[PDB]
Design a protein around this ligand. Structure first.
Ligand SMILES: [Mg+2]
Ligand SMILES: [Mg+2]
Lengths: 131, 101, 154, 198, 66, 100, 138, 132
């Protein structure tokens, strides 16, 4: 038999429709209540058991160190002074937030980076040098 | 199609408060510390004060979702005492019964 | 000392239901499961057996017609995990520009007339239409014969 | 006027007393008087009256019945589910033997509720328990480890409890609990120069 | 409501047939199936937490019921 | 009120357990709390407090016009409004009120 | 007479990966009706015995939450109606079962969880020490 | 005098069902609950959402099966399944009941994003518990 299949063969209308004629030959009404649950489970309507409260929710495949170690995102900020102390509290709080994705946590940090850039003049008056 | 105009105003307050939550949280963080300069915190005070009044979460009122009654509401079911009792007394609230002891 | 941990067993998400289903047989006092198990609603003849299911399917079609006609009423998704098969279907093309990538949309939706019209206009303008797309247009016309596939209601 | 429709006799009248009942109620289903061949009555009776019959009885409809879980059905169900199970190691006869070979305990909780959303924020929590006796800790390391963990360590039981719930997922809180156990173990073995001032 | 003697006679025929059905459901011998087993089987199959026992599901001999 | 050993042992545990490492007063610790939780306005109980009354009213109104839902209340209102016209108590045209 | 001749059995594949070991499964069910928990206890315990799982059962103390509401729509403050929600508990404690056995048993008893009954299953997994922790690098 | 959910005495001619004949203090004593779900158990969430859904389903079914319902609905939730159990009359033709079952199950499944099933029990007439 054909040894290497055409995995990337396109689904032409002729091939998609013929596959529907092969699903009609085994099309029969549900015989009992177990078959209705099986059908709902295949269709995705019924929860899969045993129950997993995280079913269908992976947080973008993020690892734990992406949520808890956020100092790699403060490289654009000053290394010392009040702006560093303030951002260590923000990242400390974001590292304890299980209701935010890594994407949303970075957005918070990026907002402060831009906010402090617009306030460079005000910060220079106070002897703080943000970039 | 909300119960009344007062429920409609709270719906808008909840929608606007949700839209400005992140912005208000970030500005407030600048005001809620003794680390940053006062010159910077004084500017943050003005910025959060300039945001729309209906973005402020203290203006949200927990009204009955079926009658818009602003008081006598049970938070767990979001119903006024009158509406809650109507359902409870007809056996339509799972597990809820009259208490005698 | 050493302990031998047993090897893990794996099965499909429906395997347990399929095992439980194997333990039961057809109930001979009952009509097929598709019918309402009620003496007044159970089919009493081969004619009612056919017509009762057609009436139930008609009700499903009326609901789907309404769901797809007024999708904004059925767009609030409170299900976790998401159920793609319980959302409204959108049968209209959302690309209104005249180009090849907009024709491919009308071909996937199987719009024979719109795809032909979009193909003519695209051709008169003199823009190049790829071969793969031209064939994908023939597969649609050659299958349905330059006729529109059946729909629920226009 | 055409003839009105006659309801058929209840199919309980066709059931044999030696039938396979699990086939009648294979899955959880509401009480059906026409299908349950029992003269069961429910309802507080009126004075010099009987409890209401099953036909049209809403009180019997309100009950989460177990007609689909008769002892005959449960025993047949489990005979088919034996092929899905694996054998517990015989060597692990007692809890003390499990602790010897498996010193770490990982606790997680799953929550089954009724509704459209399976999500529950309590499910992310992970609890890791280990006994410091199980770890290769010298006198200095055990003393430093106990000070670092603080109240996480219980002297009575000698068990270190690390509860992690700061990540969105349980797999992340599990990897973080193992990470904490690893950095605590290696820092306990490191000796700083300020420690000489104890 | 007055229950004619013929009605009670047919209510007893239903209880005896249902008694064998209930015994078959629980996989027990229909001959040695007692009223205590009936009450136990009905409490399992139709669990009711109603505080008043008189309002709970019951499958008793018509003599006892009516 | 801590020895140098205890102060540095507590600062080391904070580093390992991802706590605040710099000395921070109670006022500045509110920043940590603010970003450790969702704001009240972002909680689902807050922004989804009400059911979408537009959806429910519009859906059932549409189902009534389709003949698949009988709104007894609306039918009652329609009969009262019908009998008020025969009684002469009809709603005026906007701009054509009794005051003109 | 009209019986199936041969039955297709669900495919259970034995893997090459070792199975999870659960020291304990604590299945805590909560409900408003004690009789429903009694029937579920009987079902769950009988299911465990047939599968060869060691199971113990006990009943944690019930919780009754009471609250007071005004009886009248307007005034009459001294007249109240009091309501309660009763939460009753049953705890199935299973021991020394593999991860595959826990998946089958929990799926079987979770699918048959009566309406109005919630379940909190706490699973205690046995793990070996991470390899990095076995010896000090220093 | 208490009024809540009390069918008041008449001249002995008003037929009441078992549910209608029992005042609220008999709830959990002589009568059960018309909806069963986990939202009102201690430590459980989403009681507010389950309650709104129940109020809608009762109104939806009242107007979808007009004149057909012979008693209050019984609402059961297991997992993500929603079961609606209704006692109906035997006046509508069986074809109309199958149309409405197919229609209602489909529409409610898409509205609340869960598999919804409707279980109908027919009675020749409203079951009378007593004549008040
Ligand atoms: Mg307020
Ligand atoms: Mg009074």
């Amino acid at each position: 038999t054909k040894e290497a299949p055409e995995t990337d063969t396109s689904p032409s209308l002729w091939d998609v429709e013929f596959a529907k004629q092969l699903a009609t030959v085994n099309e029969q009404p549900l015989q009992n209540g177990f078959e209705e649950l099986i059908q709902w489970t295949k269709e995705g309507k019924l929860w899969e058991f045993p129950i997993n409260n995280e079913a269908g929710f992976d947080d973008d495949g993020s690892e734990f160190h992406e949520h808890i170690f956020l100092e790699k995102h403060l490289e654009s900020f000053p290394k010392q002074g009040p702006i560093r102390h303030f951002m260590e509290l923000v990242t400390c709080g974001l590292s304890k937030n299980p209701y935010l994705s890594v994407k949303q946590k970075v957005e918070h940090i990026e907002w402060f980076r831009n906010y402090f850039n617009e306030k460079k003049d005000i910060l220079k008056e106070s002897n703080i040098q943000f970039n | 199609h909300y119960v009344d105009w007062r429920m409609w105003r709270d719906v808008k307050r909840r929608k606007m408060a949700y839209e400005y939550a992140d912005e208000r949280l970030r500005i407030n963080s600048l005001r809620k510390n003794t680390i940053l300069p006062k010159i910077l915190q004084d500017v943050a005070d003005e910025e959060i004060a300039a945001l729309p009044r209906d973005s402020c979460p203290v203006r949200i009122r927990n009204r009955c979702v079926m009658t818009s009654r602003p008081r006598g509401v049970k938070r767990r079911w979001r119903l006024s005492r009158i509406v809650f009792r109507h359902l409870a007394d007809h056996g339509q609230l799972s597990g809820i019964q009259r208490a005698t002891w | 000392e050493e302990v031998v941990i047993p090897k893990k067993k794996t099965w499909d998400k429906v395997a347990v239901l399929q095992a439980l289903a194997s333990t039961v047989n057809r109930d001979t006092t009952a009509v097929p499961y598709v019918f309402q198990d009620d003496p007044y609603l159970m089919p009493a003849s081969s004619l009612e057996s056919r017509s009762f299911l057609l009436a139930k399917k008609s009700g499903e079609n009326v609901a789907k017609f309404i769901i797809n006609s007024y999708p904004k009423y059925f767009q609030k998704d409170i299900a976790e995990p998401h159920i793609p098969c319980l959302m409204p279907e959108y049968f209209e093309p959302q690309i209104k520009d005249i180009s090849e990538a907009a024709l491919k949309e009308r071909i996937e939706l199987r719009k024979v007339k719109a795809s032909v019209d979009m193909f003519d206009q695209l051709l008169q303008a003199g823009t190049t239409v790829s071969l793969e797309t031209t064939n994908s247009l023939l597969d649609l016309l050659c299958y349905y014969g330059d006729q529109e596939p059946s729909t629920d209601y226009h | 006027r055409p003839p009105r429709r006659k309801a058929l006799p209840p199919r309980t009248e066709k059931m044999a007393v030696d039938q396979d009942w699990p086939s009648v109620y294979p899955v959880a289903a509401p009480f059906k008087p026409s299908a349950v061949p029992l003269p069961v009555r429910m309802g507080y009776p009126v004075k010099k009256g009987v409890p209401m019959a099953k036909e049209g009885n809403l009180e019997l409809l309100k009950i989460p019945n177990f007609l689909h879980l008769t002892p005959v059905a449960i025993k047949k169900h489990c005979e088919a589910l034996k092929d899905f199970c694996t054998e517990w190691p015989a060597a692990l006869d007692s809890d003390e033997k499990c602790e010897k070979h498996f010193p770490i305990e990982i606790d997680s909780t799953d929550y089954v509720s009724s509704g459209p959303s399976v999500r529950n924020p309590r499910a992310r929590v992970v609890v890791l328990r280990v006994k410091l006796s199980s770890l290769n800790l010298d006198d200095h390391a055990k003393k430093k480890l106990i000070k670092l963990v603080g109240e996480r360590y219980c002297k009575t039981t000698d068990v270190l409890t690390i509860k992690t719930d700061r990540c969105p997922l349980r797999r992340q809180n599990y990897d973080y609990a193992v990470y904490l156990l690893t950095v605590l173990y290696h820092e306990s073995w490191n000796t700083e120069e300020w420690e000489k001032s104890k | 409501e007055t229950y004619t003697e013929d009605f009670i006679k047919k209510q007893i025929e239903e209880f005896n047939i249902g008694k064998r059905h209930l015994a078959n459901m629980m996989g027990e011998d229909p001959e040695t199936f007692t009223q205590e087993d009936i009450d136990r089987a009905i409490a399992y199959l139709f669990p009711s937490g109603l505080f008043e026992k008189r309002a709970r599901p019951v499958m008793k001999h018509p003599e006892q019921i009516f | 009120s801590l020895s140098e050993y205890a102060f540095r042992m507590s600062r080391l545990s904070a580093r390992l357990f991802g706590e605040v490492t710099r000395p921070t007063n109670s006022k500045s610790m509110k920043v940590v709390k603010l970003f450790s939780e969702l704001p009240l306005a972002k909680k689902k109980e807050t922004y989804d407090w009400y059911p979408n009354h537009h959806t429910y009213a519009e859906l059932m109104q549409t189902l009534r016009f389709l003949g698949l839902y009988r709104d007894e209340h609306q039918d009652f209102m329609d009969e009262q409004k019908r009998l008020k016209k025969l009684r002469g108590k009809e709603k005026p045209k906007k701009g054509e009120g009794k005051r003109a | 007479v009209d019986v199936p001749k041969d039955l297709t059995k669900p495919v259970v594949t034995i893997s090459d990966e070792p199975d999870i070991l659960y020291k304990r499964l604590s299945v805590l069910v909560k409900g408003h009706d004690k009789a429903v928990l009694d029937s579920y206890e009987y079902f769950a315990v009988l299911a465990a015995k047939e599968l060869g799982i060691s199971i113990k059962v006990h009943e944690p103390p019930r919780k009754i939450e009471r609250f007071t509401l005004l009886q009248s729509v307007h005034i009459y403050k001294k007249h109240r109606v009091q309501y309660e929600m009763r939460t009753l508990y049953r705890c199935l404690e299973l021991e020394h079962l593999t991860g595959s056995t826990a998946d089958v048993y929990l799926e079987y008893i979770q699918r048959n969880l009566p309406e109005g009954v919630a379940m909190e299953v706490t699973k205690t997994q046995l793990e070996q020490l991470p390899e990095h922790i076995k010896e000090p690098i220093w | 005098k208490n009024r809540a959910a009390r069918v008041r005495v008449s001249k002995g001619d008003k037929p009441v069902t078992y549910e209608e004949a029992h005042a609220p203090h008999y709830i959990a004593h002589r009568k059960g609950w018309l909806s069963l779900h986990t939202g009102n158990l201690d430590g459980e969430d989403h009681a507010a959402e389950r309650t709104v859904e129940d109020v809608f389903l009762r109104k939806f079914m009242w107007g979808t099966f007009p004149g057909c319902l012979a008693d209050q609905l019984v609402l059961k939730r297991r997992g993500n399944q929603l079961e609606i159990c209704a006692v109906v009359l035997r006046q509508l033709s069986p074809h109309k009941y199958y149309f409405l079952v197919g229609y209602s199950e489909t529409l409610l499944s898409y509205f609340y994003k869960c598999p919804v099933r409707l279980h109908l029990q027919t009675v020749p007439s409203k079951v009378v518990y007593k004549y008040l």
